Amino acid sequence: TNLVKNKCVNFNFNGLTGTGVLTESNKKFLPFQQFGRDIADTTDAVRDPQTLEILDITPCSFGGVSVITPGTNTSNQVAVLYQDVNCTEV
Amino acid sequence: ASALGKLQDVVNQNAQALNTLVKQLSSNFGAISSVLNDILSRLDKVEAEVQIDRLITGRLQSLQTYVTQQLIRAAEIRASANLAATKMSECVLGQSKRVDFCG
Amino acid sequence: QCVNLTTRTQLPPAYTNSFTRGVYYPDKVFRSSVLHSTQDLFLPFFSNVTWFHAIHVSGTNGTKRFDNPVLPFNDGVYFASTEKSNIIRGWIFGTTLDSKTQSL
Amino acid sequence: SALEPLVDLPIGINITRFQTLLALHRSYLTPSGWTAGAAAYYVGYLQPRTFLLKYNENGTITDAVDCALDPLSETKCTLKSFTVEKGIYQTSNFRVQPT
Ligand SMILES: *[C@@H]1O[C@H](CO)[C@@H](O)[C@H](O)[C@H]1NC(C)=O
């Protein structure tokens, strides 16, 4: 299925499955290799089988919603803080 | 580089347990696999229920281990923080008469 | 065919010590400047390694010694050679070294 | 020496024994020809062992360390580091075994 770049996608590569944000990446694999991995034994970076390229995997961002409010006494108005995102996914 | 070990130890132990806490995700805990979906993929749910328990029971426990560590470890820092706030108040802001409290 | 020249020779297998040797990549996963630890089949360091000779001239005149034995595979096998002029090609790996089993 | 896997093949057979192969030729009348040049090689048997693998920035493994090699090598597998700081470290326990 056509590959998705810079957009949250479920995926399967060569049977490897996960969900992340696939990007272009400059880390450099030796020929025979398949995965990359991080310190945590997550699957960090994968290589596209059909067109060899080094694709990062960053699972889609998430964070705690924080409702900032004065006392409900003074107002009903809230200002929401989405923690640790770029402002798009709103 | 060893003068800062006190700080360096704090930062490490935090990043330490996190690594350990993460690596606990990859442990079977008696379940057939550490990937939560594989148990769902291979097995019909009615049995897979019992499997996922051993993951959950394992992992859910493994949090309480991590959480309890942080509580205990924070209670140390909480004690060290007061020692600073004591020095900061007495030593920096005032002049200390306490022998070898300020060094 | 099956032309044969056993030319059996005596003397003990000349041993050696593999210092740091036989470390392959036991995965395709690309890792960078990390310390990874697995328990797998390897040739352990400081090991006993037999420097064998398939053909061995010990000089008087000629005297080429064809010694290369059939060797057990055991757990796993390591191999090393120099052979500026190739005389080595492949290996016969198998079990019966005959029919009744497959042959590598 | 880092060795990449060449091909991962469906073999499905147990191989308990083997021998190498050779390339020889024929000669003609001199005081038949065989045993071209000299031939020697190295063989050693594998074994399960725990190695710590140090990749490089480019993934080229240089330093590997066996854990069971000596009582000193087993501690470096506990710190995961090739640098071992001055001090005392507790390597895996030992037991006396029954006669
Ligand atoms: C986050 O999004 C804003 C636009 O809403 C943009 O101006 C900013 O550069 C982005 N920052 C990151 C982390 O990409």
Side-chain angles (χ1 to χ4, degrees), chain A, chain B, chain C residues 1-7 9-104, chain D:
Chain A
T1 82
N2 187 35
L3 186 138
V4 164
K5 258 181 202 200
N6 286 337
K7 185 180 78 178
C8 178
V9 293
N10 186 339
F11 61 82
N12 181 337
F13 288 166
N14 296 340
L16 171 65
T17 59
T19 298
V21 174
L22 302 177
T23 62
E24 292 177 349
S25 61
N26 58 344
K27 293 178 178 178
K28 186 176 179 179
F29 287 25
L30 313 168
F32 65 97
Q33 286 170 327
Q34 186 61 56
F35 302 160
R37 288 185 182 276
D38 191 3
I39 307 301
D41 188 67
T42 63
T43 300
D44 180 70
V46 294
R47 182 183 64 197
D48 183 1
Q50 302 188 353
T51 59
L52 302 176
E53 64 183 344
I54 311 302
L55 301 177
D56 284 342
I57 292 173
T58 298
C60 53
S61 63
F62 61 93
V65 175
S66 294
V67 173
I68 295 170
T69 178
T72 190
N73 197 24
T74 59
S75 175
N76 292 337
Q77 189 173 357
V78 299
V80 177
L81 170 67
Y82 294 144
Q83 291 180 337
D84 189 7
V85 274
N86 189 212
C87 292
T88 53
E89 297 79 353
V90 174
Chain B
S2 65
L4 293 177
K6 293 179 178 178
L7 267 59
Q8 189 63 56
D9 181 68
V10 171
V11 177
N12 288 336
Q13 294 178 338
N14 294 338
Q16 183 61 57
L18 294 175
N19 284 339
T20 296
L21 180 61
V22 171
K23 292 176 179 176
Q24 296 299 102
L25 292 177
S26 63
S27 294
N28 294 337
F29 293 157
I32 63 171
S33 179
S34 67
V35 175
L36 179 62
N37 297 339
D38 287 344
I39 298 174
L40 295 174
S41 67
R42 183 176 76 189
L43 299 179
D44 288 343
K45 294 179 179 179
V46 176
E47 294 177 351
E49 300 302 321
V50 179
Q51 294 300 323
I52 294 172
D53 288 346
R54 293 183 185 174
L55 291 184
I56 294 174
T57 297
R59 293 181 182 173
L60 174 60
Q61 183 177 357
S62 178
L63 287 174
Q64 294 181 338
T65 296
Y66 170 75
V67 174
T68 299
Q69 294 302 320
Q70 298 294 274
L71 293 175
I72 295 170
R73 182 168 295 105
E76 178 180 2
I77 304 301
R78 180 68 182 93
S80 178
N82 290 337
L83 176 61
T86 300
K87 294 179 183 296
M88 184 67 74
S89 296
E90 301 181 353
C91 202
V92 173
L93 267 64
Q95 183 176 357
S96 177
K97 301 300 289 184
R98 301 173 65 185
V99 177
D100 291 348
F101 174 76
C102 290
Chain C
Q1 295 84 359
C2 289
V3 292
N4 54 287
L5 62 80
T6 62
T7 69
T9 166
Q10 304 292 328
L11 265 65
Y15 294 139
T16 187
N17 197 33
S18 64
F19 308 97
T20 61
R21 192 61 61 184
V23 176
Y24 56 88
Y25 298 150
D27 272 342
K28 296 176 179 178
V29 175
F30 178 80
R31 293 179 179 83
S32 297
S33 63
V34 296
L35 296 175
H36 183 61
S37 296
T38 58
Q39 56 184 20
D40 188 4
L41 298 174
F42 299 102
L43 176 61
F45 288 178
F46 300 108
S47 272
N48 114 99
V49 188
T50 317
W51 170 57
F52 280 111
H53 300 291
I55 273 89
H56 188 82
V57 52
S58 64
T60 177
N61 190 340
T63 63
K64 296 294 180 64
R65 298 293 181 86
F66 170 85
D67 183 66
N68 58 343
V70 294
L71 291 170
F73 183 85
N74 289 336
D75 292 343
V77 169
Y78 169 76
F79 179 83
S81 63
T82 61
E83 298 299 321
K84 43 182 45 173
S85 57
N86 65 331
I87 197 193
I88 302 300
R89 302 300 173 89
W91 301 268
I92 67 171
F93 295 105
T95 296
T96 307
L97 301 176
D98 188 71
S99 63
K100 293 174 292 296
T101 61
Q102 297 177 338
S103 297
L104 174 61
Chain D
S1 297
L3 280 71
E4 76 285 4
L6 295 178
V7 293
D8 51 352
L9 281 181
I11 296 276
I13 183 173
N14 186 30
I15 294 169
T16 190
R17 185 174 61 256
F18 66 94
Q19 186 178 176
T20 187
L21 290 174
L22 294 166
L24 305 177
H25 60 75
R26 299 292 175 87
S27 179
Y28 300 96
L29 273 71
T30 56
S32 184
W34 282 115
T35 67
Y41 57 88
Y42 299 84
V43 173
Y45 288 95
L46 299 177
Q47 183 175 356
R49 287 291 183 89
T50 304
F51 290 169
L52 65 85
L53 280 65
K54 183 181 66 62
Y55 296 86
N56 198 34
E57 49 181 359
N58 59 352
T60 307
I61 289 172
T62 57
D63 184 7
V65 174
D66 183 4
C67 302
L69 170 69
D70 68 0
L72 188 146
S73 296
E74 187 175 2
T75 59
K76 296 192 167 183
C77 271
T78 319
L79 318 170
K80 298 292 181 64
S81 174
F82 291 169
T83 299
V84 169
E85 297 81 357
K86 179 171 175 291
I88 177 171
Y89 299 128
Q90 184 170 352
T91 304
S92 65
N93 305 314
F94 71 95
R95 294 180 294 103
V96 175
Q97 311 286 3
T99 63

PDB file of all heavy atoms in Angstrom, chain A residues 85-88, ligand 1:
ATOM      1  N   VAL A  85       2.909  19.156  22.487  1.00  0.00           N
ATOM      2  CA  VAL A  85       2.596  18.930  21.045  1.00  0.00           C
ATOM      3  C   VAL A  85       3.073  20.149  20.249  1.00  0.00           C
ATOM      4  O   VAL A  85       3.213  21.233  20.849  1.00  0.00           O
ATOM      5  CB  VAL A  85       1.093  18.676  20.827  1.00  0.00           C
ATOM      6  CG1 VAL A  85       0.728  17.213  21.018  1.00  0.00           C
ATOM      7  CG2 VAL A  85       0.236  19.569  21.709  1.00  0.00           C
ATOM      8  N   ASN A  86       3.306  19.965  18.947  1.00  0.00           N
ATOM      9  CA  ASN A  86       3.258  21.093  17.981  1.00  0.00           C
ATOM     10  C   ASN A  86       1.793  21.515  17.843  1.00  0.00           C
ATOM     11  O   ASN A  86       0.925  20.633  17.969  1.00  0.00           O
ATOM     12  CB  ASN A  86       3.813  20.687  16.615  1.00  0.00           C
ATOM     13  CG  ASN A  86       3.973  21.877  15.696  1.00  0.00           C
ATOM     14  OD1 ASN A  86       3.829  21.755  14.482  1.00  0.00           O
ATOM     15  ND2 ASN A  86       4.261  23.027  16.287  1.00  0.00           N
ATOM     16  N   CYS A  87       1.510  22.798  17.596  1.00  0.00           N
ATOM     17  CA  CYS A  87       0.109  23.123  17.419  1.00  0.00           C
ATOM     18  C   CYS A  87      -0.251  22.882  15.977  1.00  0.00           C
ATOM     19  O   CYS A  87      -0.082  23.745  15.109  1.00  0.00           O
ATOM     20  CB  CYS A  87      -0.192  24.549  17.765  1.00  0.00           C
ATOM     21  SG  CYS A  87      -0.069  25.062  19.500  1.00  0.00           S
ATOM     22  N   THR A  88      -0.770  21.679  15.712  1.00  0.00           N
ATOM     23  CA  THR A  88      -1.505  21.314  14.515  1.00  0.00           C
ATOM     24  C   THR A  88      -2.652  20.416  14.948  1.00  0.00           C
ATOM     25  O   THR A  88      -3.826  20.747  14.769  1.00  0.00           O
ATOM     26  CB  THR A  88      -0.609  20.619  13.494  1.00  0.00           C
ATOM     27  OG1 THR A  88       0.058  19.527  14.123  1.00  0.00           O
ATOM     28  CG2 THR A  88       0.417  21.577  12.934  1.00  0.00           C
TER      29      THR A  88
HETATM   30  C1  LIG E   1       4.465  24.369  15.763  1.00  0.00           C
HETATM   31  O1  LIG E   1       3.355  24.880  15.028  1.00  0.00           O
HETATM   32  C2  LIG E   1       3.408  26.294  14.856  1.00  0.00           C
HETATM   33  C3  LIG E   1       2.178  26.745  14.078  1.00  0.00           C
HETATM   34  O2  LIG E   1       1.005  26.486  14.859  1.00  0.00           O
HETATM   35  C4  LIG E   1       4.691  26.686  14.132  1.00  0.00           C
HETATM   36  O3  LIG E   1       4.757  28.111  14.019  1.00  0.00           O
HETATM   37  C5  LIG E   1       5.907  26.181  14.894  1.00  0.00           C
HETATM   38  O4  LIG E   1       7.097  26.484  14.161  1.00  0.00           O
HETATM   39  C6  LIG E   1       5.794  24.677  15.079  1.00  0.00           C
HETATM   40  N1  LIG E   1       6.910  24.193  15.866  1.00  0.00           N
HETATM   41  C7  LIG E   1       7.435  22.987  15.669  1.00  0.00           C
HETATM   42  C8  LIG E   1       7.976  22.306  16.891  1.00  0.00           C
HETATM   43  O5  LIG E   1       7.469  22.468  14.566  1.00  0.00           O
END
